[PDB]
Amino acid sequence: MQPKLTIWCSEKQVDILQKLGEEFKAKYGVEVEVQYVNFQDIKSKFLTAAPEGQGADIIVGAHDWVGELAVNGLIEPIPNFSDLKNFYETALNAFSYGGKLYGIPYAMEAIALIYNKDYVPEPPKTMDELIEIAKQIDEEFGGEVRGFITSAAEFYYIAPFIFGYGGYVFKQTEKGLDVNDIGLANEGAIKGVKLLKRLVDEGILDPSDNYQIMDSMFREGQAAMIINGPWAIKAYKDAGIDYGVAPIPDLEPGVPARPFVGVQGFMVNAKSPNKLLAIEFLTSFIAKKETMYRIYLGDPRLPSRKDVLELVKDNPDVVGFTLSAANGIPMPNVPQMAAVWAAMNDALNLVVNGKATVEEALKNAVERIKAQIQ
Ligand SMILES: OC[C@H]1O[C@H](O[C@H]2[C@H](O)[C@@H](O)[C@@H](O[C@H]3[C@H](O)[C@@H](O)[C@@H](O)O[C@@H]3CO)O[C@@H]2CO)[C@H](O)[C@@H](O)[C@@H]1O
Numbered sequence: 001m002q003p004k005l006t007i008w009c010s011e012k013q014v015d016i017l018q019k020l021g022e023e024f025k026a027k028y029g030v031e032v033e034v035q036y037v038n039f040q041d042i043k044s045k046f047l048t049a050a051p052e053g054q055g056a057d058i059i060v061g062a063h064d065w066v067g068e069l070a071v072n073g074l075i076e077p078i079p080n081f082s083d084l085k086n087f088y089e090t091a092l093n094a095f096s097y098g099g100k101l102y103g104i105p106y107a108m109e110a111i112a113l114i115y116n117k118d119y120v121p122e123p124p125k126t127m128d129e130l131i132e133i134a135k136q137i138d139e140e141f142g143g144e145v146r147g148f149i150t151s152a153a154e155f156y157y158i159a160p161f162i163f164g165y166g167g168y169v170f171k172q173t174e175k176g177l178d179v180n181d182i183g184l185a186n187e188g189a190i191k192g193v194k195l196l197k198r199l200v201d202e203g204i205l206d207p208s209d210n211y212q213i214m215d216s217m218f219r220e221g222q223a224a225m226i227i228n229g230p231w232a233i234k235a236y237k238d239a240g241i242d243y244g245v246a247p248i249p250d251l252e253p254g255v256p257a258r259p260f261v262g263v264q265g266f267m268v269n270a271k272s273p274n275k276l277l278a279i280e281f282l283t284s285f286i287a288k289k290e291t292m293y294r295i296y297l298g299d300p301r302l303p304s305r306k307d308v309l310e311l312v313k314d315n316p317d318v319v320g321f322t323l324s325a326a327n328g329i330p331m332p333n334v335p336q337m338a339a340v341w342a343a344m345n346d347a348l349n350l351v352v353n354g355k356a357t358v359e360e361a362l363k364n365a366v367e368r369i370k371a372q373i374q
Pocket residue numbers: 010011012013038039040062063064065109154155156211229231262341
């Protein structure tokens with residue numbers, strides 16, 4: 001009786017994983033099923049389903065999930081394998097928690113300025129320049145083209161401002177992250193969110209702006225500049241957008257934006273009776289040089305396998321995202337990170353809708369996070 005491996009992933013990885021699964025099935029007789037799940041729903045769907053025996057055998061996603069999923073006993077440790085040496089230790093460590101490896105990374109990433117060269121032949125070097133350019137575009141195209149869009153109320157996208165000015169999630173110490181020392185309402189975090197509010201107040205961003213508006217408008221030729229990640233580029237290229245990638249403009253002279261750095265990878269369900277076969281699929285096939293490069297070609301980010309990064313290092317997009325990631329900060333993978341996102345998103349929603357001062361919203365966010373952690 002042929003066994004089956006089911007994979008959950010975002011829309012970006014489906015086609016390539018589907019094809020690779022078909023190849024694995026032809027060779028080995030193992031059925032492979034690739035199921036789209038919206039990225040924002042994967043971890044919660046898995047937290048719910050895995051204990052009920054209805055979780056996928058493999059899930060694809062971001063390394064910040066690892067602590068939460070590892071402490072809850074839902075993802076399987078990955079034993080050593082022949083290709084381990086071929087992956088950057090930084091990417092492996094992102095997928096490691098409590099001394100064990102919990103995923104096979106395929107790429108790293110950070111958000112950056114993506115710009116449509118039809119509207120902005122040369123990208124802005126500072127946020128002040130970006131603001132002027134966006135206002136010009138907004139006036140000149142009289143509403144049909146947005147000067148600038150990002151997900152205005154989503155912490156992940158506003159983090160580069162927060163971190164740029166010296167905010168932090170959990171204090172980095174020589175003994176590790178201090179989850180009792182939260183920096184998301186410190187003076188730097190306030191200054192970063194005040195920059196967000198400035199963008200809204202100057203009419204550059206709208207309170208309703210979110211990921212879908214950003215992504216669709218840019219893909220459809222109706223946005224000059226956005227702050228988004230490498231996951232979005234292939235769709236833009238396929239839609240015929242003449243785009244470039246550059247670091248987010250410096251917040252002020254000599255003060256760079258500092259985005260989150262993420263690592264994307266494959267994780268195995270510890271409750272799955274196919275976990276051994278899932279691990280084999282990942283280490284013996286997914287992890288190989290050609291397979292990792294083919295994943296890049298289907299979903300181009302920053303490859304985590306060293307000899308694959310070497311193949312793409314001169315792609316202008318890789319160059320741009322790399323320059324952005326160089327000023328960035330890896331997301332924590334500790335379980336407590338789960339408590340951060342909703343509180344901060346809610347704070348930023350209050351700010352961009354003029355419901356609270358930056359100081360009040362962020363101070364309350366931090367109180368909420370601490371209570372949840374404790
Ligand atoms: O906002 C909370 C959220 O932040 C982090 O999620 C970000 C991802 O790490 C990042 O990759 C990007 O997600 C994209 C997927 O990679 C891509 O395949 C496709 O599905 O589009 C996604 C963007 O819509 O952006 C998200 C932030 O939206 C963190 O990893 C999450 O755990 C956290 O919940």
